[PDB]
Structures are given as C-alpha cells and as structure tokens.
C-alpha cells in the first residue's frame, strides 16, 4: 500500500508537469491501487494489501 502510495506519491512529479497533473498519474496509481488491492484480496485474505 506504500508501493501504490510510494508509486502514487512517486507519480506526483512535483511541478506539476502542466500545473496540477500530480493526481493524474497518482490517481492512475490509485486505480492500480484498487485493482492491485482487490486483486490481492482475491489473492491473499490474511495480509498483503487486502484493501
């Protein structure tokens, strides 16, 4: 969740690459955080990024 919240926080590119496109790639990593989250709860119930 800090690989999607360090990939997400890493996808800021703090400029913001037009002026505020940090949440474009960051929220894209939030969509990948929902997909990796629900995919990993489909994978692992006890731990490893349930939700």
């Amino acid at each position: 969740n800090s690989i999607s919240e360090m990939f997400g926080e890493m996808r800021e590119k703090y400029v913001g690459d037009q002026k505020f496109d940090v949440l474009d790639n960051m929220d894209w990593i939030f969509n990948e955080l929902i997909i990796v989250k629900e995919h990993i709860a489909n994978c692992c119930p006890p731990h490893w990024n349930i939700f």
């Binding site: 690989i3 990796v36 995919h39 489909n42 994978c43 692992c44 731990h47 490893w48 990024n49």
Partner: protein, 151 residues
C-alpha cells in the same frame, strides 16, 4: 525427545548448504515467471527454510545458553548461509513479491502465489511474534505472577 542431535547436525548443516542453495532457488527472481517463479513455492520455501532457520532466528532467542556454546556459534556460520540466506531470501522474495505485486497485473498467479506467501508467513509471523510478545505477556501473566508475585 531430548536427543535431537543428529537432526540439528544434518539440518543445521543442510540448513547451511541447502539455504545457501535457497539463497538463489528459494530467493528466485529475474523477473517474475509468476513472481519468482511461484513465490508461494519459492519465497515461502525461504519462509519455512527460515522457519527451520527460526531455530537460528527465533529459537536462537529460545536457545539462549541451553546446554552448550556452539549450538548457536558453530551453527551460526551455518546460519549465515542458513538464516539470513532464508529470511532475507524470503525478504528478497517478499520485497520482490510485493514489488512483483506492484507490477500492474500483478498477476493472477504471481500475486496469488507471492501474496499467498505474504499472508501465510505474514499472519503466521503475526501469531508467531504475537506468541513471543505473548511469551512476554504470558510470562508477564506467568513469571510476573512469580517474580512479581510480589513475594
């Protein structure tokens, strides 16, 4: 049952050599091939190989001057390729498992096996160190009802 010698010699020695082999085989990577390939086989093979080396990681903290001096010294060089070549092999396979689970699919069998190792040894580690913190809380329940009786 107080005669576990030869199992500790062939399993501390085989824990040295075979987890030196499992410093690459159970520490499998490059790149995924289903995340190790198969980190429920691979990274959790380094978990149980680190649970057999939890005799040298967690039951090194249980065998604290039990009967001899080389049970954790001559087996410590058998735990250099034994413990941190299995626990960090499960952490190269675990940081590369969740990092492999940070790989956009990631995947329907890569995060399945890899996350299955990272829930098996994760929650097993949680009840394990919860059994050691409940060995200081079952000892705080027990030995602090004996040493801290107060009598």
């Amino acid at each position: 049952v107080n005669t576990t010698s030869s199992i500790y010699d062939r399993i501390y020695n085989f824990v040295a050599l075979m987890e030196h082999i499992e410093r690459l085989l159970v520490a499998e990577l490059a790149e995924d091939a289903l995340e190790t390939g198969c980190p429920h086989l691979l990274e959790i093979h380094f978990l149980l190989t680190s649970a057999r080396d939890f005799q040298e990681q967690v039951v090194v903290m249980a065998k604290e001057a039990t009967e001899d001096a080389q049970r954790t010294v001559m087996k410590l060089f058998s735990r250099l390729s034994g413990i941190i070549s299995k626990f960090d092999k499960l952490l190269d396979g675990l940081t590369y498992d969740i990092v492999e689970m940070a790989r956009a699919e990631q995947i329907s069998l890569a995060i399945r096996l890899f996350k299955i190792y990272d829930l098996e040894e994760r929650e097993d580690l949680r009840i394990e160190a919860i059994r050691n913190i409940i060995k200081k809380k079952e000892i705080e329940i027990e030995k602090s009802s004996i040493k801290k009786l107060p009598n």
